[PDB]
Amino acid sequence: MPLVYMNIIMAFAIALAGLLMYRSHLMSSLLCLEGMMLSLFIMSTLIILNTHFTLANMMPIILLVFAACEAALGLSLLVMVSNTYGTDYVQNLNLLQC
Amino acid sequence: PTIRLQEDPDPEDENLYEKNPDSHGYDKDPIVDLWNMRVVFFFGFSIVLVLGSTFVAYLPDYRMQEWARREAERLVKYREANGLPLMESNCFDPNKIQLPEDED
Amino acid sequence: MNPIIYTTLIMTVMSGTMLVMISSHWLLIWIGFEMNLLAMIPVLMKNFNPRATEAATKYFLTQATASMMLMMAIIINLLYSGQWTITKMFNPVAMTMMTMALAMKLGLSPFHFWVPEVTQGISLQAGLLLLTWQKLAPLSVLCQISQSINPNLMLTMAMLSILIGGWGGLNQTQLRKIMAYSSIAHMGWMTAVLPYNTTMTILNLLIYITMTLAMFMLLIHSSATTTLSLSHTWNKMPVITSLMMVTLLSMGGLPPLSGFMPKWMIIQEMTKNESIIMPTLMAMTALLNLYFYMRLAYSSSLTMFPSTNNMKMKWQFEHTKQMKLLPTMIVLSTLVLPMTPALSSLN
Amino acid sequence: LQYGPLAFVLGERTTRKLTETSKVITVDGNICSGKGRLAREIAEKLGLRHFPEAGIHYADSTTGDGKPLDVQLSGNCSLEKFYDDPKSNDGNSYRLQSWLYASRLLQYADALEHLLSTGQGVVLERSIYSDFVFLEAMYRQGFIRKQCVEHYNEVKKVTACEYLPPHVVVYVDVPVPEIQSRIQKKGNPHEMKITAAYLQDIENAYKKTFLPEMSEKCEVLQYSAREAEDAEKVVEDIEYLKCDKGPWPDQDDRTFHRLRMLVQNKLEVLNYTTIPVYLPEITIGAHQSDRVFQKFTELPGRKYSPGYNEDVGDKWIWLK
Amino acid sequence: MTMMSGRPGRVPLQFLPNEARSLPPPKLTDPRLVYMGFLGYCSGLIDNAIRRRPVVSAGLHRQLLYVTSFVFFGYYLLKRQDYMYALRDHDMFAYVKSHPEDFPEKDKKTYGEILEEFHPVR
Amino acid sequence: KFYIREPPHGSPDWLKVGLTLGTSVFLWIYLIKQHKEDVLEYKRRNGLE
Amino acid sequence: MLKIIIPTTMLLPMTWMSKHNMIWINATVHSLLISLISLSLLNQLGENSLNFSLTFFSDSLSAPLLVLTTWLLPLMLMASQSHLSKETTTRKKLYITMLILLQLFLIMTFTATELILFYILFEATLVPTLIIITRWGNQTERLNAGLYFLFYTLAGSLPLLVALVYIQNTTGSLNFLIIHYWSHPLSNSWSNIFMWLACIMAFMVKMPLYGLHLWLPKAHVEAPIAGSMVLAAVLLKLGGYGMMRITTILNPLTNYMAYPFLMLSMWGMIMTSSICLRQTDLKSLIAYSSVSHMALVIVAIMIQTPWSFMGATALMIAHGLTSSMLFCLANTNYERVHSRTMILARGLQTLLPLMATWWLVASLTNLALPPSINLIGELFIITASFSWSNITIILMGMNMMITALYSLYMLITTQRGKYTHHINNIKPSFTRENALMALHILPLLLLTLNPKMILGPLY
C-alpha cells in the first residue's frame, strides 16, 4: 500500500478517535462523524479509480447521499436537545443510567 | 393513623364440631363430609389395602425362584451320581477362550 | 404523529431490514442499515418527553458509529480483493472491524451500555420493536460471514454479554432495564454458537423473539413499567400475572418449558466441537437471569402486595384494545419443547 | 368499527363535527349554592348534555346497570361520616377526596368523549380543575396530612395535563352566612356540622387561586345568588363570549385524534390514580384486597365481560 | 457454519422441494399433529381467559379456528422436517459409500479373544 | 340489564361467525384433499401401487 | 405404561370440571384407583426389566418407587383439604393441579429409558414444588426457602446435562439398556475425574449429602403439608434412583472418587443425628432425621455391592413412608396450636390417646425396630459397610444409638409429662387425621411379610 492509502486510513482513525473522545459540544462530535464520511469517500474513490472499476464509480456518490441523511438526522436531534437545555452539552444527557 | 394500611383483623379458626358434632373433619357440609369419609374409607381400606394386598400376595412366580430350585436339584442329582464336582470353578469353557500369546 | 406517517415509518424500518436480508452486495447491506436507522429514530421519539430525546440521541450516536466502522471494513475488504459480494471476508483486519461494528449494533458486551438506557427512555411499544425486530439484520449478516469469524473474539464477547446481562439484571427495579439486560444475555447465547452452527443461532433467536413478544405484550396489557406498579396487577387481573409468571419461568430456561430448548440445543452443539468449559460456564451464569426473573415472579404473582383504594374503580372497566397474537405467543413461549426436532426445518 | 387509527386513516375527523356550540361549560360555586339548577337550565337552553355532579357512585352508573354498588365494593368512603368525624383516624377524609377526584376524572373523560364523538356540548358542575378547593379546605382545617396533599398533587400533575380545560367557567357566588342558613333550612342532620371556617376556606380557594388561573386561559363569568336564577341572561351572556384565549382554537385533527384515543379506554384514563405511593389512608392490605375483590366478582353482572354473563340474561354465549 | 444452506440444486425459498413428494406423508393421526392441535386448543382457552370470557365454552368457532390453524400449519411443518432429515440421511449414506477408505469395514473379534481388565469391587 | 346497551350481545355477529366457520371447514377440506394427493403421489413414485 | 400415565393426565380436566364441593372426593377416589392400577407393576422378572416401549421401562428398582409415588397423592389430598378450606375454588383447583403435575412428572421420571429424558423430567419436578412452597407456605421465610431449593438443585444439575450430551457424543446413545450392555471402564485421568463429578454431584445435592443439605431444613420446614410430604417421601429418592442408574458408567473410577463422599456421609450421619437432639422446632427435627437417614443410602450406593443396593432400596421406601407419617403427625398439632415449637404443647397423650399411639408407632419405625423394613434396609447397609471396612461398625453403631435417642425424646416431649395449662382449644382427633395416619402405617407393616417386593433388582 502506498503512503496515500495509509494517510487516508490514518485520517479515518483520527476521526473515529475524535468521535469517541467526547469533549463538551455535541456539534463537535457531529463534525467528526462528517469527517469519517469524508475519509471513507476519498478511500473508496481512490480504490475504485485505481482498479478502473467503472460501475463502482457511482457508489461514492451513493455514499455521499446517506452521509447527508445521517448529518441531517444528527442536527435534528441537536435541535431538540438544545430546546430542552439551552445548550448542546452532552453532560445534560444523563437522565437514563445503566 | 399509625397503621400503615387498612386491613382485616386476623380471623379465628373455625371448629367443625360446633355445627356438626359428628363432623369427621372432611368438610363443612355434613352430607359432603360424610360421603368424603365413606369414599376414603371404602376406596382406601376395602379396595386398595385389602384387595391390593391379596393381589400382590398371589402374584405368579415370574422371578423364577421355584424354577431355579428345581434346576439346582436336577443338576445336584446328576452330578452326585456321576461323581463330578457339585459346582464348577469356571463358568465359561476354556476351549472357547483365546488368551494372549504368551505370559511375557 | 399521524397514523399514516407512523405506518410508513414502520414499513421503512422493515424495508431496511429486508434489504439487508436479501442483498448480495455489501453496499446494499450498508444502505439497508442506514435506511433502518433513519426511520428508527422517529419511532423512538413518538412521545416527546425529553427522556425519549435522550434515548434517541444515544441510539443514533451508537448506530452511526457502528455504521461507519462497518463501511470502513467493507472498503478494506474491497481494497484487498476487488469484491463486493458478502462472503468469507478475505481480510482479517476487515473481519475484526466488521465483527466489532456488528457487535456494537447488536449491543453485545462491551458495546452493551446503550441498551438499558435507550430501552428505559422509550415507550413499551418502542422497546418491543427495539428488542425484537432490530436484531434480525445484524444476526443475518453474521450468519453469512460466520465461517471467517474469529472464534476467540466472538466467544469472548458472548461470554462477556452473558456475564454482564446476568449481573446487571440483579440490580434493577425498572422493568425495561430488566428486559434490556435479559436481551444482552440472550444475545450472548445466540452469538456463542454462531461459529459452530447458524441453525442453532436462528432457533435461539426465534424462541427469544416469541418470549420477548409475550413478555412485552403482557407488560403493555397491564400498564406497568416498575416492579411496584406490576405488583398491583394481581388485584385487578390475576390471569395476566399467572401467565407472566409462567413466561418468566420459561425465560429462566427451566425444563419442560420452551426457554430450555435453545440452551439445551446450544450446549449439545458445543460438545460436538469439543467445547466443554464454555457451555458449563454459560449454563451456570444463566442462573443470574433465573434469579432476577424469580424475584419478579415473587413480586407479582406468587405473593400478594398491598393495593390502593382507587383500584376499586378499575374493577368496573375492561381492557378495550385486545392483542390477538398474545395467546399464541404465550403458548409458543411455554409449551413447545415436545416439538424440538422440527428445528431441522430451519436448515 | 370502534374509533382508532384505521378510522382516522379512512376519513373521520373531529374538526368537522364542531359547530361553535361545543363550549365545554363548568358551573362552579360553593356548597348548597344554586349551581345545579343553573347548570340544568343552561344545558336546556343551549341544547347541551348536562352532567350531574359526579359523586361517590358515579362510576357505578356508567357500567353494568346504573344501580350503585355497596360502599365496600365501590368508593369505600362516606361523605356523611366525613361530616360526622372529619378528623377520624381511619383515613376516611383523604380516601373520600381521592376517590372523588378519580370520579371527576372519569366524568371529564366521558364528557370529552361525548363531545368529540358527537359534536354536542356538555355542561358539568365541577371538574378536576376545581376539585382541589375541597382538598385545601380539608388541609387548612387539619382534616388531612401534608402527605395526602402531596399525593393529591402528584396524581393531579400526571392526569390533568392530558386534557383541554373548559371553554366557559361559570361561578355562582353566594356568601358564607347565606349558604349556612340554606344548610340549616335543608334538613340534612349531617350537613349542619359544616363549620363556617370550612366554607370560608372553600371560598378562599375558589377566589384566590381557582378563578385567577382559570381567567388567564378563558373568560370567567361570575354571578350573584339573585342573578344566578335568571338563566336566560346567563345563556345570552355565554352567547356573546369571544373565545380567543384558550388552547381550544389551537387544536388540530391529530391532537384531537390523540385526545379521543385517550378519552375512550377508561383504564388508560385512570392509569395514574393508583400509583404505588403507600399512604395509610388509601393503602389496603393484601388480605382485605383479596376478600373485597372476590366479593366484587360475585356480583350478578361482574364475573365476565358484559356480553358473557349467563346469569343476567345473556344468550348465544357459546357463539360469541 | 451452515451445513446444508448451500446444497447443490436447492431452490431458494421453496419450503417443499419436488423430491419431498417421494416420502410417505405424515398420518393425520400423527401424535405430533395431535400435540399441535392441543397447542391450538390451549391458545383458544388462554384467549378466552385474557378476554374475561367463560374459558371452556365462550367461543366455539374461535376455538375451532385455533385448533384448525395449528393442525394445518403443523402438517406442512412435519412434512418439511421429515424431508430434511431424509436428506441428511441420504447425503450421509452417499458420502460413506463414496469414501470407503475413510470408513473401513473392520473384522470384529469375539469376546472370547478380547482381553478386558477386571476391576474387583471390594 | 345493562346501562349502555352493550352492542355486542345476545344476537352474535353472524357475518364473523360465518367467516370463522367457513375458514375452519375450508382449511379442513383442503388438508384432507392434500393428504389424499400426497398419499397417491407417494405410492405412485415408490412403485407401491 | 400409558395405562398409568393417561389416567393421571385425566385427573386435570376431571378436577377442573368438578363441582366446587366435589373436587376433593373425585381427586381422592381416582388417585386411589390409579394406585390400584400401579400395583400391577410389582410383577417383576428375575433377569431383565419390563421394557414397555422404546421410551418407558420398569425395573424392580423403579416399581416400588412408582407405587409409593401413586400412593402418596391420595394422602396428600387428604392432608391438604383442611388448611385450604377458606381458599377460593380456582386456587384449590390450582393446588390440586400442582399435585397432579408433580405426580405425572415423577411417574415419567422413574420409567424413562433414556437419561436425557430422565434429566428433563427430573428437572421439571422443580416447578410445581417451588410453586407449592412459595405460594401456599405460611411464613415469610418460604420465599427464601424457595430460592434455596431452586438454586442448590440447579447448580448441581447444570453440569450433569453438560456431561450427558457429552457422553452421547462419544458412546452414541443415552439409552440405559445400551449404556449397561456396552459399558466400558473409566480411565484414571483428570478429564474422567471431572466427568465423574459432573455425573454425581447433581444426585448428591438431591439426597442431600451432608455439606450441601442446607436447602432441606428450610424447604421442608416452610412448605405446606403436602409439599413437605412429597419432598421427603419421593423427591429425595430421585437422587438415590439416579445415582443407582448412573453408577454403571462410573466404574472403576468410583473406587477412589467415593472416599470424600463416604467420609462426609459417615460423619454427617452423626452430625445431623446429634443436631436432632437440640432442636426447638419439631418439623425441623423431622427434616434433619431425613438427612441422617439418606447419608446411609449414599454410603450404600457408593460401596457398590448387592447387599448395599438391596438395603438402599428398602431404606428409601421405608423412609418415604415414615417421614411422610411424621410430617403429618406434626401438622395435626400445628393446626391446633399454630406453632412448631416442640415444648409449647405437652402431655398430649392425656388429651389425644389414639394419636399418641400413632406417634409411638411412627417413632418405633423411625428408630428401625425389627422386623420393620426400616431395620431391614439399615441392617443390610450396615452389613455391607462392615464388609467394606470393619471400623465402620463404630460409626454405624453410634448413629443407631443417637437415632433412638432423638426419636423417643421427640415422643417424650410432645406426648408425656403434663399438658400446658393455658391451651384449651385442643379438639378431639378427626376421622380424616386418624385415617391419614392409618394409611401411612398399615402398608409399612404389611411390607414386612413380603420384603422382596422392595429389595430392588439385586434380590
Ligand SMILES: CCCCCCCCCCCCCCCCCC(=O)OC[C@H](COP(=O)([O-])OCC(O)COP(=O)([O-])OC[C@@H](COC(=O)CCCCCCCCCCCCCCCCC)OC(=O)CCCCCCCCCCCCCCCCC)OC(=O)CCCCCCCCCCCCCCCCC
Ligand atoms: C426463519 C423463519 C422465521 C422468520 C421470522 C421473522 C421475524 C418474526 C417477527 C420478528 C419480530 C416482529 C416484531 C414486530 C414489532 C412491530 C412493532 C409494532 O407494530 O408495535 C406492536 C403493536 C402495539 O400496538 P398498540 O401500542 O396497542 O397500538 C397503538 C398504536 O401503535 C398507535 O399507533 P397509531 O395510532 O399511529 O396506529 C397506526 C397503526 C394502524 O394502522 C393503519 O391505520 C394502517 C394505515 C395504512 C397507511 C398506508 C401507508 C402506505 C404508504 C407507506 C409506504 C411505505 C413503503 C416502505 C417501503 C420502501 C421500500 C424502498 O399502525 C400500526 O400500529 C403499525 C403498522 C404496521 C405496518 C407494517 C408495515 C410492514 C412493512 C413490511 C416491510 C417489508 C416489505 C418488503 C421489503 C423488500 C425489500 C425492499 O402490537 C403488536 O404488533 C404486537 C406484536 C405483533 C408481532 C407479530 C408476530 C410476529 C409475526 C407473526 C406473523 C407471521 C410472521 C412471519 C411471516 C412469514 C412470511 C410470510
Ligand SMILES: CCCCCCCCCCCCCCCCC[C@@H](O)O[C@H](CO[C@H](O)CCCCCCCCCCCCCCC)COP(=O)(O)OCC[N+](C)(C)C
Ligand atoms: C385393631 C386390633 C388389632 C389386633 C387384632 C387383629 C387380628 C389379627 C390380624 C393380623 C394378621 C397377622 C399376620 C400373620 C401373617 C399371615 C399373613 C401371610 O400369610 O401373608 C403373607 C402375604 O403378604 C403379602 O405378600 C404382602 C402384601 C403386600 C403389601 C402391599 C400394600 C398394598 C399397596 C398400598 C400402597 C403402599 C405403597 C407401597 C410402596 C412399595 C405371606 O406371604 P407369602 O409367603 O408369599 O404367602 C405364601 C402363599 N402364597 C405365596 C401362595 C400367597
Ligand SMILES: CCCCCCCCCCCCCCCCC[C@@H](O)O[C@H](CO[C@H](O)CCCCCCCCCCCCCCC)COP(=O)(O)OCC[N+](C)(C)C
Ligand atoms: C416458538 C416456536 C417458533 C415460532 C415461529 C413462528 C410461527 C409461524 C410460522 C412462520 C410462517 C412462515 C414460514 C413458512 C412460510 C414459507 C417458508 C419459505 O418461504 O421459506 C423457506 C424457509 O422455511 C423456514 O425456514 C421454515 C419455517 C418453520 C419455522 C418453525 C421451526 C421452529 C423450531 C422448532 C420449535 C417448535 C415449533 C413448533 C410450533 C408450535 C425458504 O427456505 P430458505 O430460504 O432456503 O432458508 C432461509 C434461511 N437460510 C438460507 C439461512 C437457511
Ligand SMILES: CCCCCCCCCCCCCCCCC[C@@H](O)O[C@H](CO[C@H](O)CCCCCCCCCCCCCCC)COP(=O)(O)OCC[N+](C)(C)C
Ligand atoms: C461441603 C460439600 C462439598 C462437596 C464435596 C466434593 C468433594 C470433591 C473432591 C474430589 C475427590 C478427588 C479429586 C481428584 C483426585 C485426587 C486429588 C489430589 O488431591 O490427589 C492427588 C492429585 O495430585 C495433585 O495433588 C493435584 C491436585 C492439587 C490441586 C487441586 C486442589 C485441591 C484442594 C482441595 C479443594 C477443595 C475441594 C472442594 C471445592 C469447593 C493424587 O496424586 P497424583 O498422582 O499426582 O494424581 C493422580 C490423578 N490423576 C490420575 C488424574 C493424574
Ligand SMILES: CCCCCCCC/C=C\CCCCCCCC(=O)O[C@H](COC(=O)CCCCCCC/C=C/CCCCCCCC)COP(=O)(O)OCCN
Ligand atoms: C450445589 C453445588 C454442586 C456443585 C456441582 C458442580 C461440580 C460439577 C463437576 C464439574 C462440572 C464440569 C465438568 C464438565 C463435564 C465433563 C465432561 C468431560 O468429560 O469433559 C472433560 C473436560 O473437563 C473439564 O473441562 C472440566 C474442568 C472444569 C471446568 C469448570 C470448573 C468448575 C469447577 C471445578 C471444581 C468444582 C467441582 C467440584 C465441586 C463440588 C461442589 C462444591 C474432558 O473432555 P475433553 O476436553 O474432550 O478431553 C479429552 C480430549 N482432550
Ligand SMILES: Nc1ncnc2c1ncn2[C@@H]1O[C@H](COP(=O)(O)OP(=O)(O)O)[C@@H](O)[C@H]1O
Ligand atoms: N369534591 C368534594 N369534596 C368533598 N365534598 C364534596 C365534594 N363535592 C361535593 N361534596 C359534598 O357533597 C354535598 C353536595 O355538594 P354541593 O355542591 O355543595 O350541593 P349540591 O350539588 O347538591 O347543590 C355537599 O355536602 C358537599 O359538601
